[PDB]
Amino acid sequence: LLGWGLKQAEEANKTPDKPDKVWRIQAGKGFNEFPNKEYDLYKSLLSSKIDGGWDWGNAATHYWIKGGQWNKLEVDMKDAVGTYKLSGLRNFTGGDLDVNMQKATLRLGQFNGNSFTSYKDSADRTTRVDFNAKNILIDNFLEINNRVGSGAGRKASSTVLTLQASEGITSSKNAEISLYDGATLNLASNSVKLNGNVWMGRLQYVGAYLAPSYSTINTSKVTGEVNFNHLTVGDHNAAQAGIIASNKTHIGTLDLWQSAGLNIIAPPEGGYKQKTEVQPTQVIDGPFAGGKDTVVNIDRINTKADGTIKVGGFKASLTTNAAHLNIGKGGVNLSNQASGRTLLVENLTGNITVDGPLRVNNQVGGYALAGSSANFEFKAGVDTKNGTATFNNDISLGRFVNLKVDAHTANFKGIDTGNGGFNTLDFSGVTNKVNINKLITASTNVAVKNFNINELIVKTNGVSVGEYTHFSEDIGSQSRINTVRLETGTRSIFSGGVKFKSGEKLVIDEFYYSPWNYFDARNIKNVEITRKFASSTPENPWGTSKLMFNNLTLGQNAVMDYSQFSNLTIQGDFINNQGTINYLVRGGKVATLNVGNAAAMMFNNDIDSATGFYKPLIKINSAQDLIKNTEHVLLKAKIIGYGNVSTGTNGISNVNLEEQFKERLALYNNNNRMDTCVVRNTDDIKACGMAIGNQSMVNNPDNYKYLIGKAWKNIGISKTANGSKISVYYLGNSTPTENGGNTTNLPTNT
Numbered sequence: 001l002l003g004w005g006l007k008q009a010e011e012a013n014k015t016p017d018k019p020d021k022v023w024r025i026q027a028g029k030g031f032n033e034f035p036n037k038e039y040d041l042y043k044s045l046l047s048s049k050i051d052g053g054w055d056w057g058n059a060a061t062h063y064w065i066k067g068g069q070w071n072k073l074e075v076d077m078k079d080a081v082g083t084y085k086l087s088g089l090r091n092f093t094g095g096d097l098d099v100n101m102q103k104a105t106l107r108l109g110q111f112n113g114n115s116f117t118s119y120k121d122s123a124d125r126t127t128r129v130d131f132n133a134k135n136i137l138i139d140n141f142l143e144i145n146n147r148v149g150s151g152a153g154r155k156a157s158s159t160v161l162t163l164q165a166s167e168g169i170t171s172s173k174n175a176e177i178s179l180y181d182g183a184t185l186n187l188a189s190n191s192v193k194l195n196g197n198v199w200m201g202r203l204q205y206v207g208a209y210l211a212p213s214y215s216t217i218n219t220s221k222v223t224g225e226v227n228f229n230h231l232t233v234g235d236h237n238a239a240q241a242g243i244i245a246s247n248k249t250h251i252g253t254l255d256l257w258q259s260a261g262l263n264i265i266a267p268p269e270g271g272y273k274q275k276t277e278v279q280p281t282q283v284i285d286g287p288f289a290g291g292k293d294t295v296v297n298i299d300r301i302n303t304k305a306d307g308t309i310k311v312g313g314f315k316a317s318l319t320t321n322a323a324h325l326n327i328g329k330g331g332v333n334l335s336n337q338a339s340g341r342t343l344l345v346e347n348l349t350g351n352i353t354v355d356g357p358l359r360v361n362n363q364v365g366g367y368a369l370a371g372s373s374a375n376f377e378f379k380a381g382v383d384t385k386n387g388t389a390t391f392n393n394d395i396s397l398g399r400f401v402n403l404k405v406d407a408h409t410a411n412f413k414g415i416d417t418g419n420g421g422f423n424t425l426d427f428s429g430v431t432n433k434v435n436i437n438k439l440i441t442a443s444t445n446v447a448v449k450n451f452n453i454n455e456l457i458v459k460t461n462g463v464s465v466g467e468y469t470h471f472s473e474d475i476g477s478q479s480r481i482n483t484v485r486l487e488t489g490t491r492s493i494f495s496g497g498v499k500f501k502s503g504e505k506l507v508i509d510e511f512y513y514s515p516w517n518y519f520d521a522r523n524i525k526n527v528e529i530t531r532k533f534a535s536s537t538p539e540n541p542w543g544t545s546k547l548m549f550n551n552l553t554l555g556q557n558a559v560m561d562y563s564q565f566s567n568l569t570i571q572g573d574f575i576n577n578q579g580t581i582n583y584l585v586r587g588g589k590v591a592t593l594n595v596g597n598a599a600a601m602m603f604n605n606d607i608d609s610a611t612g613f614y615k616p617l618i619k620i621n622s623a624q625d626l627i628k629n630t631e632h633v634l635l636k637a638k639i640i641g642y643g644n645v646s647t648g649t650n651g652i653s654n655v656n657l658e659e660q661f662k663e664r665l666a667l668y669n670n671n672n673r674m675d676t677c678v679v680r681n682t683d684d685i686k687a688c689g690m691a692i693g694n695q696s697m698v699n700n701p702d703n704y705k706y707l708i709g710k711a712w713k714n715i716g717i718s719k720t721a722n723g724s725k726i727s728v729y730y731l732g733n734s735t736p737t738e739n740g741g742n743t744t745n746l747p748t749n750t
Helices: 004-011 684-692
Strands: 098-100 114-116 129-131 142-144 161-163 193-200 226-233 240-244 248-250 253-256 261-265 295-297 300-303 316-320 342-347 352-354 375-379 389-391 439-441 456-458 480-486 497-499 507-513 533-535 552-554 574-576 581-583 618-620 630-636 710-712 717-719 725-730 743-745
Touching: 004 240, 004 261, 253 316, 300 342, 342 352
Parallel strands: 098 129, 114 142, 129 161, 193 226, 226 248, 226 253, 240 261, 248 295, 253 300, 261 316, 316 342, 342 375, 352 389, 439 456, 456 480, 480 507, 507 533, 552 574, 581 618
Antiparallel strands: 630 725, 710 743, 717 725
16 A cells, blocks of 8 residues: 555655674684684674573564663674584564675585564664675575464564675575565675575464565666566565666566565666654655666566456566566466456666567466456556567467567567467557567457568458457558458358458568458548559459458559459549459459449559560450350449540650550450560560460461551450440450551550
8 A cells, every 4th residue: 555665765765773781702812723613603603692582472482682672782702713604593573784705705504594574663663683794505495574372472574684795695596585574675785696485475373364565676886787687576465566677687587476666776877875753854756767788687477366356367577677678588487366466567767678489377378268368567667658578489379368568669570369369469659660470360459550560461360340440540641561461261151251341551572362351441531552462362252351441542563363253342543553464264254343433543654675565554364265246244333534644645745645544554365465565575475366266376376467567456255444434345356457457556665
């Protein structure tokens, strides 16, 4: 209810105590010349002025200083050389030790653990236990502010432990450091490397699951290499731990609880530093920004999730104000009970670089039920709004898992959610871009305001409907997809598909049709295609494909493949730029193409040297069985508005609008152009006579000499190119005479 940011900021600025009977013990002669003796420190020195006892009410042991828990002692060695150990000081209430041991190796555990506790008196005192050794070498467990016995008797107040070596504070493998509700820990050596279970926050009493349970490991002075190995926050409560580190914190396995917080705080930029009565200035801290090179290399985040069921999740969280939060190859795990647990990997003023697989219940897919909506959550650069959330590993989300990223530029490498479905892939906090490299979706709730996803997969989702890709917010102006690839649905029902809600354009390069997956393109008015527009079954189309548009505008060189096997349904303005649309019959008849309001076009002298003519602007290929003497409606339209770079047509000239558009269309059948036959030599006369079925152009190419720098339009083939209809009237494959007529010239603008 208070929060850790108040608690540590009020406990860091305190006077220690006011104790009477300041005992002073100096280790005189005898100690300071045996460098390897392996002394004891309790029995040989400290037991003179530390008396044991028994508390009537839940005692195991009971230690204080002398005549109560309000008496300071001190030990002033400063030259005692050797190696010392505590080895069994349990339930030490005491108060105000400081064992000043220069050039003396400590060992704070051997065959038995240690404990440092206080009592909740009417004075509300701390302990302020200090040490000043050279190495420390913990080597067995230490419980700071533990429970004394079991519940009853006197309760435990706060404490402070300070370990101030000058060569390293290491630890052994089985040294469980477990600091509790009121405990802190200050370290000041170089290269802390705790290779054991650090346990911030624990059940202090037997059933109190609703304790606040704060803690602090203030490793502020550590000039070397902080290295945890196994950090574990919280146990059956809402623990809010905090580590004020020294801007380089490699840890190992992190094991949060369901409702466990973590406030890793990097240092600032320049580093740290009847009668009235005046309390001292209680300087408080706000959430500030870390320095430049502040790195927190947490390499595995698990979560222990069991217990009760609440109306939501429980929102495990960690909060870091460092300039980087690298998460390595261990990735993210999340245990899941019946309600969907929630992980909040927050960053205040930095970046997030996750390089691992987002697991849940310790597998990559991780299916979850409907009431279990697992909520991954990332906040990269909140208070400065210029932080990227780069996920350099190909993530994979199963069913009922809800990623949300609220950053500046959420880069990715691949998102794969088509396996599970029902995934809220939120991106609502994104400032500008979400640069996804690969996408797999079945029934998703994507909400991106601006992006460029250069690969897209439109999956189906069984036979049920109401399950679809849903871009449920505005797509904006700078949006882009560089590849859309629909895959084949299921027979007789449009199960899966893609629908939008808003936006104005999305520059697509390549697209694929599919049987029974609908590409609904609601409300977006400039759906642009730039290259090939094919089907996912490219040589054998079938089925239907609802391309339920509201506008499009196709640009340069983008070939289309429109048949009866793809009901391309336009409710808007099919506009074509210099793009070569291809057709096909699949049964001798051409499917019409419905332009909603206007098909206004504009071109140039799009001449090539492969043919000598212009590029064939609208082609009807694979019309080998095209029915002669029959109107085949190519497209039903309202305005065929031709243009070029001027109003006058055929490149740049003053020619009228529609009659030359019969020239730029082509009928490519029998593997050559049969509408016109554009000729620059004698070699293509062979294939031209193969196209029109005449041996007068096959056996002798020099029989017809009207075609050196010229061409000829085939009589018996008529087309419309006026302002209301384009229809092709294939009614004759007639043999052209040599010098009688029906001949055309070359453009020749090169």
